[PDB]
């Protein structure tokens, strides 16, 4: 079965072209005579431009194939203009005209100058790899993918070893190693069918690594989670039920080790954890299961009275990095409680606890979020004392942050 037809250009487009040129009152047989001649020349060239596609070993007809198909038929590749003399440009392709259907048809002549030029890509290089080792295709990233008998593990004896080298490198004794392992996790194509043992090693590790608050052990495991996530080959949402309570624990937990000093890293432990937490709510999303569940736990962490301030700071960060609308709808009715907590830490003399440090970090983070939440939905008028209607927390400094954001927008 083949119902192949002969499609030509419409004749009602050929009369528009003729009467817009000075040739009026053309007959239909005169006009049909134009649209079978030019529809043959389009068919003659597209059949001839398919020769250059096959010879160049491509499956996509590029724009340059018609430039060589035209030159082959002794017609100039120039499309925009036609030179009768033909001497200024002799069968020289000018690359066509970058024109659109939905274009503006008028631009400003300094808009084209002030835009940044695109980056010239890398030059052609020759790398070698292995498709087959004595018949077997390796799983390198340059490749695409009555007694019962004594069973074998679903990993090669060798297979167990990498699990072993990558895990002993990912506990971060040396930083370049850490990276070598990291490189492997982020782009090994054959890292599926080893992923249960990696997820179990992560999950089990954080839970026996918060018994004593060992920050590096945790910062390395969170980097291992981040390296597991951006791998495109492996299927992760079968294992995310172990991954998510591990990261929530990094963000919402108390620190058993020295309270100050590494709190700077602790903020990053909560910074890396809140980054991977909102990346996990970005992916793996179905109706009302993952994002709303972690949002509900973050909000009942917030509205809980008389919290640990480490847990408070971590949950504040976690609810803060959830996107545009989430701080637009959630952080709004709670400024008074935040201010009262700050006032209590300030009044009570107790300085040797971690409450004061937790309070300062929470206030700074909340004030930065409130700044764009404001820069985003209102004009920058009355930036001096109108914020005193919101208890006067960030005030003019918040206004200065909004002004810096406006300057960044102007630079963009």
């Amino acid at each position: 079965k083949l119902k192949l037809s002969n499609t030509v250009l419409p004749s009602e487009s050929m009369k528009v072209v003729a009467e817009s040129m000075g040739i009026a009152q053309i007959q239909e047989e005169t006009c049909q005579l134009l649209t079978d001649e030019v529809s043959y020349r389009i068919k003659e060239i597209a059949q001839d431009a398919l020769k250059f596609m096959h010879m160049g070993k491509r499956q996509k007809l590029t724009t340059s194939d018609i430039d060589y198909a035209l030159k082959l038929k002794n017609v100039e590749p120039l499309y925009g203009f036609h030179a009768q003399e033909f001497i200024p440009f002799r069968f020289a392709s000018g690359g066509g005209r970058e024109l659109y259907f939905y274009e503006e048809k008028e631009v400003d002549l300094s808009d084209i100058i002030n835009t940044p030029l695109p980056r010239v890509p890398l030059d052609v290089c020759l790398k070698a790899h292995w498709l087959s080792i004595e018949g077997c295709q390796p799983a390198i990233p340059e490749n695409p993918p009555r007694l019962k008998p004594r069973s074998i593990h679903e990993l090669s004896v060798e297979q167990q070893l990498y699990y072993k080298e990558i895990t002993e490198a990912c506990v971060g004794s040396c930083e370049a190693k850490r990276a070598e392992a990291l490189q492997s996790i982020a782009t090994d194509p054959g890292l599926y069918q080893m992923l249960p043992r990696f997820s179990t090693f992560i999950s089990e590790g954080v839970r026996v690594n918060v018994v004593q608050n060992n920050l590096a052990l945790l910062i390395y495991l969170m980097r291992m989670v981040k390296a597991l996530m951006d791998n495109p080959t492996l299927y992760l949402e079968k294992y995310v039920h172990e991954l998510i309570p591990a990261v929530m624990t990094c963000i919402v937990s108390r620190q058993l080790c020295l309270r100050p000093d590494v709190d700077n890293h602790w903020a990053l432990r909560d910074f890396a954890a809140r980054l991977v937490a909102q990346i996990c709510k970005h992916f793996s999303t179905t109706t009302n299961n993952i994002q709303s569940r972690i949002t509900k736990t973050f909000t009942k962490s917030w509205v809980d009275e008389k919290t640990p301030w480490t847990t408070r700071y971590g949950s504040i960060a976690g609810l803060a990095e959830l996107g545009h609308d989430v701080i637009k709808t959630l952080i709004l009715p709670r400024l008074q409680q935040e201010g009262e907590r700050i006032r209590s830490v300030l009044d009570g003399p107790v300085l040797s606890n971690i409450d004061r440090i937790g309070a300062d970090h929470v206030q700074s983070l909340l004030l930065k979020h409130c700044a764009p939440v404001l820069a985003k939905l209102r004009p920058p008028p009355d930036n001096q004392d109108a914020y005193r209607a919101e208890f006067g927390s960030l005030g003019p400094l918040l206004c200065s942050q909004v002004v810096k954001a406006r300057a960044q927008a102007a630079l963009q």
Partner: peptide, 25 residues
């Protein structure tokens, strides 16, 4: 549609919130 593979993934069938360790000791 309740036999869709996702329904049976244990993220959508497990109270994994209970695992998060808060103030452990």
């Amino acid at each position: 549609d309740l036999l869709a593979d996702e329904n049976f993934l244990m993220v959508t069938q497990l109270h994994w919130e209970d695992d998060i360790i808060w103030d452990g000791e």
